[PDB]
Backbone atoms as SQL, in Angstrom:
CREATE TABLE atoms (id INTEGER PRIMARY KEY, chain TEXT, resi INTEGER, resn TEXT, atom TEXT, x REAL, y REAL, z REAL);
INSERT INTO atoms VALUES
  (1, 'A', 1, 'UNK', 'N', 91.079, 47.484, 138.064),
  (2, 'A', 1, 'UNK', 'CA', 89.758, 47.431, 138.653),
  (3, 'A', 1, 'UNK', 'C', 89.608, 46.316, 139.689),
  (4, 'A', 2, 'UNK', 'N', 90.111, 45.051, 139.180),
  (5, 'A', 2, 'UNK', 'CA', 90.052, 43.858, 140.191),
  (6, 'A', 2, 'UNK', 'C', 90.863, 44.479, 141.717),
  (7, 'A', 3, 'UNK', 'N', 91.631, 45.276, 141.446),
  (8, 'A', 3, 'UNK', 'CA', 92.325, 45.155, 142.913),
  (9, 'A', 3, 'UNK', 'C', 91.282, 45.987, 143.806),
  (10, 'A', 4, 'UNK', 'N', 91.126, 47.273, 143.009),
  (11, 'A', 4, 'UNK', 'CA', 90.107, 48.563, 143.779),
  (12, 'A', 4, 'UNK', 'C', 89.106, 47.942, 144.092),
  (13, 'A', 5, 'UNK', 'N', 88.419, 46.879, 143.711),
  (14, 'A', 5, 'UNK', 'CA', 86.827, 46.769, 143.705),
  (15, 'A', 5, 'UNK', 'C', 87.204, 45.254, 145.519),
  (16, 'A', 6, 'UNK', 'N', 88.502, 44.544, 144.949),
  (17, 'A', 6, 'UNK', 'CA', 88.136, 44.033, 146.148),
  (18, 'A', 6, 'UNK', 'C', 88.839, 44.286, 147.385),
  (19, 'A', 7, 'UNK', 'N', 89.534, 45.105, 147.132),
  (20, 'A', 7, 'UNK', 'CA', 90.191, 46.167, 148.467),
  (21, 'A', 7, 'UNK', 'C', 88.973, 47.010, 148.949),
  (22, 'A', 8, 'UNK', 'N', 88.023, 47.671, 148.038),
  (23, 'A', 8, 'UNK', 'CA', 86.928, 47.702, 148.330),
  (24, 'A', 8, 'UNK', 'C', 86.040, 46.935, 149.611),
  (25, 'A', 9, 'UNK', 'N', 85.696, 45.712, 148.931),
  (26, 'A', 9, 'UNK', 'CA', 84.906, 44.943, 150.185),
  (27, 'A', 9, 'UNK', 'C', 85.664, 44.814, 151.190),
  (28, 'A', 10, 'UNK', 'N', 87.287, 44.579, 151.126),
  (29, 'A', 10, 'UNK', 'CA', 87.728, 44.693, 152.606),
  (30, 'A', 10, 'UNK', 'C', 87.254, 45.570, 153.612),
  (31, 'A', 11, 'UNK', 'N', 87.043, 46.708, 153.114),
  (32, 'A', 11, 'UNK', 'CA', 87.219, 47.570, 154.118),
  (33, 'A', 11, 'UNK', 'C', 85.949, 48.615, 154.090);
């Protein structure tokens, strides 16, 4: 979840 959520705000 941690990776998806702040790969998320990257982009």
């Amino acid at each position: 979840a941690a990776l998806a959520a702040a790969l998320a705000q990257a982009l």
